[PDB]
Amino acid sequence: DSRYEHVMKLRQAALKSARDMWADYILFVDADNLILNPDTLSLLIAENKTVVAPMLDSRAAYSNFWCGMTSQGYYKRTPAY
Amino acid sequence: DSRYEHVMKLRQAALKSARDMWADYILFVDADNLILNPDTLSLLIAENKTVVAPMLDSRAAYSNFWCGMTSQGYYKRTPAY
Numbered sequence: 788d789s790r791y792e793h794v795m796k797l798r799q800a801a802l803k804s805a806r807d808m809w810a811d812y813i814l815f816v817d818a819d820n821l822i823l824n825p826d827t828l829s830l831l832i833a834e835n836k837t838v839v840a841p842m843l844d845s846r847a848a849y850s851n852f853w854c855g856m857t858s859q860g861y862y863k864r865t866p867a868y
Numbered sequence: 869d870s871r872y873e874h875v876m877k878l879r880q881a882a883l884k885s886a887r888d889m890w891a892d893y894i895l896f897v898d899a900d901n902l903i904l905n906p907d908t909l910s911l912l913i914a915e916n917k918t919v920v921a922p923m924l925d926s927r928a929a930y931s932n933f934w935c936g937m938t939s940q941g942y943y944k945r946t947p948a949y
Binding site for chain 2: 808
């Protein structure tokens with residue numbers, strides 16, 4: 788709980804600092820992720836979206852794009868994942 | 869000449885500060901100027917030009933718009949003025 792609260796506070800502080808500089812767009816990419824392709828920030832911002840996210844693949848099914856919350860935020864295997 | 873240097877330095881400081889805030893458009897208004905129309909800023913922004921300046925009224929033919937300089941900054945009374 789303490790770690791989650793600290794992470795939430797840090798993320799909100801990052802958002803607040805991103806708002807005070809009149810800065811358009813913000814890409815809060817964590818340390819574990821690795822943006823391999825060069826056209827990430829070039830192609831991603833070209834869709835005029837509210838919060839657009841990139842499809843980060845991996846060695847298995849798990850990725851950064853859930854397909855639906857069932858009852859309490861748990862991952863629900865939708866028929867399109 | 870010292871007054872001119874100080875005024876130019878102040879204008880340069882304002883311009884430099886206007887680009888450290890990642891802002892768009894800068895309005896430098898003199899103390900003796902009064903904006904009668906409250907919608908002047910929106911109309912000026914809607915002009916879609918690099919540098920703009922509206923026509924400030926005066927009791928005489930003198931205005932904030934010069935029709936041209938002759939050789940070294942002397943006023944040239946062009947017929948279009």
